[PDB]
Amino acid sequence: DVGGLDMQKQEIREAVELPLVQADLYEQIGIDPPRGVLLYGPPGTGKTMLVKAVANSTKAAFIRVNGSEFVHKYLGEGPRMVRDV
């Protein structure tokens, strides 16, 4: 449902879908797969349906936590909610 990003989506599958299938490809070749992923660009262009398309094609565990929801009305609850994720 989203075209034109095949150049960008190809690098996403290598850093997301690829290490979740075969983990020995990075050990034999000797390349450290990126653990974190940041997505830049002006707000309202990418992201959005891209993460949903990758999560649907992977068919595995997926956790989506909003960046503004970590803070809780209680004080010490903030660091505990981050650990539970």
User: Per the annotation, where are the binding residues?
Assistant: 41-48
Q: What minimum distance in Å lies between the beta carbon of 24 and another protein?
A: 12
Q: What minimum distance in Å lies between the beta carbon of 30 and another protein?
A: 2
Q: Residue 84 and residue 45: Cα distance in Å, rounded?
A: 31
Q: Which residues does the annotation place in the binding site for ATP?
A: 41-48
Question: Which residues contribute to the site for another protein (CB under 8 A)?
Answer: 27-31
Nearer to another protein, 6 or 27 (CB): 27
How far is CA 48 from its chain centroid?
12
